[PDB]
């Protein structure tokens, strides 16, 4: 079971084994636990009842994450494979997943100053930086989506990071994330760096809608036919035009017409600079 990244080949033997004795589970978060090794960690467990194939997949995602080195990709602290159940130790992300965060932290009468446009643009920039790192190292994520991004904390200093690599791990139907996929992925099973660009546009829509499911009211098959025919999502409520434009550029039908992440980053930067953009009020959910 070998994995190749950035020029180097690796095996599970390369994974940093942490003695099971040094690991204490604190509480459940989702299975995933808050743990201590005193370094605080997230502990991903492999159910003992699963297959030898699931165990192989489990270990492969460990290897994949451990070989990344970037601030916007969750760190792997190590593993505990000498005991059952098997543990993967990850950077603890106290802010939780991004979709849940957006939904739970939406501006409302309780506190209309929960989030502002700049907060959303910073999350977008954070994930775009992670995606650019994957792009420049020729890694295709295949499932860029709010559910797979994590926050270091709920508060204003939060940093967003790509936290799940299960789809890339498998690749290395009713469950396929069709709503995040470009046509050539849909129809031909073709994946490139521009695959992730399309998904990032959908992620941007998720962010600026404050956590709505993409293509609201549409089923997967309806979305497939919609997108193939040239259909695209409308802007999220109150979304500034410059931000919607990034989305529509990401969703160009031809992959060669979609921006790479370096371009996406510079466009996100330009948005953060425009006072008209960042002074735009987010909708208050009543």
List, as residue ranges, the binding site for ATP.
Answer: 44, 91-93, 164
Dist CA 181 CA 48 (whole Å): 33
CB 177 within 8 A of CB 239: no
Catalytic residue among 97, 126, 143, 196: 143
Give catalytic status of residue 274 as yes or no: no
Contacts of 238 (CB under 8 A, 6+ apart): 280, 281, 282, 283
Which among 71, 87, 64, 51 has a CA at the least distance from the CA of 9?
Answer: 64
Q: How many CB atoms lie within 10 A of CB 163?
A: 21
The DSSP secondary-structure symbol of 17 reads: B
- Max intra-chain CA distance, the chain: 57
Elucidation method:
X-ray
What DSSP string describes 51-80?
-HHHHHHHHHHHHHHHH---TTBPPEEEEE
The DSSP secondary-structure symbol of 50 reads: S
Q: What is the resolution of this structure in A?
A: 1.9
User: Distance from CA of residue 54 to its chain's centroid?
Assistant: 22
* Topology (CATH) of 1-92: Phosphorylase Kinase; domain 1 (3.30.200)
Q: What count of Cα atoms within 13 Å lies in the side-chain half-sphere of residue 142?
A: 17
Which among 99, 104, 119, 98 has a CA at the least distance from the CA of 281?
Answer: 119
CB 37 within 8 A of CB 87: no
Dist CA 123 CA 117 (whole Å): 10
Contacts of 201 (CB under 8 A, 6+ apart): 246, 247, 248, 249, 250, 251
The DSSP secondary-structure symbol of 111 reads: B
Helix (H/G/I), strand (E/B), else coil: 6: coil
Could you tell me the residue ranges of all domains in the chain? 1-92, 93-274
Q: Based on the number of CB atoms within 10 Å of its own CB, is 82 exposed (0-12), middle (13-18) or buried (19 or more)?
A: exposed
Cα-Cα-Cα-Cα dihedral of 213, 75, 32, 171, to 10°? Answer: 60
CB 148 within 8 A of CB 180: no
CATH number of 93-274: 1.10.510.10
Contacts of 170-179 with C-beta under 8 Å, sequence gap 24+, read 170/57, 171/142, 172/3, 172/60, 172/64, 174/220, 176/220, 177/143, 177/145, 178/220, 178/223, 178/224, 179/213, 179/214, 179/215, 179/220, 179/223
């Amino acid at each position: 079971p070998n994995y190749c990244f950035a020029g180097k080949t690796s095996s599970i033997s390369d994974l940093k084994e942490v003695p099971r004795k040094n690991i204490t589970l604190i509480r459940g978060l989702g299975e995933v636990y808050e743990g201590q090794v005193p370094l605080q960690v997230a502990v991903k467990t492999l159910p003992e009842v699963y297959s030898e194939q699931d165990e192989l997949d489990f270990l492969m995602e460990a290897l994949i994450i451990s070989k990344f080195n970037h601030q916007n990709i969750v760190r792997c602290i190590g593993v505990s494979l000498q005991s059952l159940p098997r543990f993967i130790l990850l950077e603890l992300m106290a802010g939780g997943d991004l979709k849940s965060f957006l939904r739970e932290t939406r501006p409302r009468p309780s506190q209309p100053s929960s989030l502002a446009m700049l907060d959303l643009l910073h999350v977008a920039r954070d994930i775009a930086c992670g995606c650019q790192y994957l792009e420049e190292n020729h890694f295709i994520h295949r499932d860029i989506a709010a559910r797979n991004c994590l926050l270091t904390c709920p508060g204003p200093g939060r940093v967003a990071k790509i936290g799940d690599f299960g789809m890339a791990r498998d690749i290395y139907c009713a469950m396929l994330p069709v709503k995040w996929m470009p046509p050539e992925a849909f129809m031909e099973g073709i994946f490139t760096s521009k695959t992730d660009t399309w998904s990032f546009g959908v992620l941007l829509w998720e962010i600026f809608s404050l956590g709505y499911m993409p293509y609201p009211s549409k089923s997967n098959q309806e979305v497939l036919e919609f997108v193939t025919s040239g259909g695209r999502m409308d802007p999220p409520k109150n979304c500034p035009g410059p931000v919607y434009r990034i989305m529509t550029q990401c969703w160009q039908h031809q992959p060669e017409d979609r921006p790479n992440f370096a371009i996406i980053l510079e466009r996100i930067e330009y948005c953060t600079q425009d006072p008209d953009v960042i002074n735009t009020a987010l909708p208050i959910e009543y």
